[PDB]
């Protein structure tokens with residue numbers, strides 16, 4: 001192993017429902033109040049304090065582990081580009097990664113980016129879920145290429161403004177998500193996630209060297225494959241059923257959520273987020 005990276009006191013997180021700690025809730029309340037067409041209260045009533053899970057997301061755990069403050073800009077539904085899985089948000093706010101980065105840079109008044117802050121990026125799942133649910137026309141390989149380009153452009157734009165430290169999360173294992181299984185879309189997910197995860201870290205290692213960045217790559221797929229091959233070691237019992245079914249309708253939650261991998265048909269439980277955030281903290285000194 002290599003030397004641990006330097007300690008972290010501030011995180012700025014960008015991403016989707018795997019990171020959101022209340023922005024989708026706040027923003028959809030704002031949109032409902034203004035009567036925006038098609039708005040829905042997200043995430044909904046069978047979720048914990050606005051997170052798309054039954055507890056803190058992995059980046060919240062990561063911040064606790066590292067002794068860092070967290071500014072969490074992630075929005076549930078966020079795509080790698082400007083917009084969201086929810087198309088009805090675009091006429092109000094651009095909540096994709098590109099839009100989160102634009103809003104972060106616009107809310108420093110001109111006051112500098114913190115060169116010591118860790119810029120955490122965790123996105124791409126909604127590029128695939130939007131494409132499958134609404135019959136997108138890109139071949140999956142072109143979709144993956146657009147996801148990688150969008151993430152690299154976000155790191156480039158944050159670096160241009162003065163960011164120096166990053167942690168980018170790979171695609172998750174979309175191929176075991178319950179909604180993907182139920183859609184009979186396992187092979188498509190495998191092909192998508194393998195294309196992103198082969199290309200992205202090669203692109204980010206070139207950008208890290210050019211711009212003199214500290215950029216760590218977290219392989220969520222390796223992480224999940226190890227937990228799901230050895231579930232008992234981690235106190236997991238149920239790897240496929242959601243603890244809290246929502247499709248086609250809401251049904252009562254399981255009694256033992258700490259023994260489940262999935263909270264709903266897309267998102268992991270607090271237990272898996274906890275393990276993920278501990279794993280992400282492994283490259284860093286406290």
Ligand SMILES: CC[N+](CC)(CC)CC
Nearest residue numbers: 076077085086126129266
């Ligand atoms: C973005 C939110 N989801 C689709 C409806 C995940 C893709 C789940 C509720």
